[PDB]
Every structure is written in C-alpha cells, then in structure tokens.
Design a protein around this ligand. Structure first.
Ligand SMILES: [Zn+2]
Length: 119
C-alpha cells in the first residue's frame, strides 16, 4: 500500500551513482526512471539500480518523468536539484524533470530508447 515500487524497493546505494556503477562493473548512462524523496531508481546498463541521494548534474532521465506542462514553468519552490538542461523537481507532491530543451533531449531516453540503451 503506497510503498512497493513506490517509496521502497530493493537496492539503495549510499554513495554516488558514479561510485555505484564503476563499483559493480557497468559504466553505462544512469537513466532515472523513478524519483522519490527516499532516492531514485535508474534503468542503467541492463538493469534497474536503486539508491538514495541526489541526481548528479549529468544523469539521464526517463521521458516519462520529464516535465512538459503548458501551464507550468520551473519554480524554485519545487526545485529539489538541478541537472544538465533539466531540473529534477518535486511539484504537486510528485517528481519530474523540467527540461529546458525537450527537443534535442537534455538527458532524456524515451521508454523505447531506454530499452535500447539497456542493450
Ligand atoms: Zn547498476
């Protein structure tokens, strides 16, 4: 009940996503597919990797998480952290990534691409 695949889950690195990857072996792009206050879960390399902390500046986000809203502009009240081109933000009790450039992909893999990036 509002925990499984939400706030909880297996894995939760304490160190940085870079320290995560190079530790285990894969050095692939970390595509954050799920964001929470208790950390995030990335689809990187081949698998899903879960950890707690902040998204690094050059991390990759899932297109499912990015914020394209016709009424919403990036508010510092919702900004939790900033990444390259986008902002990992918590608005309306939910987490998004505000992409300033949704056209050329400012760190965005589509759900389709994510599965290609995991190959
Ligand atoms: Zn991993």
């Amino acid at each position: 009940s509002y925990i499984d695949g939400d706030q909880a889950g297996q894995k939760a690195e304490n160190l940085t996503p870079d320290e995560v990857s190079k530790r285990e072996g894969i050095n692939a792009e970390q595509i954050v597919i799920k964001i929470t206050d208790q950390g995030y879960v990335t689809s990187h390399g081949d698998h899903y990797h879960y950890y707690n902390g902040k998204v690094p500046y050059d991390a990759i986000i899932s297109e499912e998480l990015l914020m394209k809203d016709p009424n919403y502009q990036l508010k510092d009240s919702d900004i939790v952290n900033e990444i390259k081109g986008g902002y990992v933000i918590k608005v309306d009790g939910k987490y998004y990534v505000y992409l300033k450039d949704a056209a050329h992909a400012d760190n965005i893999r589509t759900k389709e691409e994510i599965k290609r990036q995991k190959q």
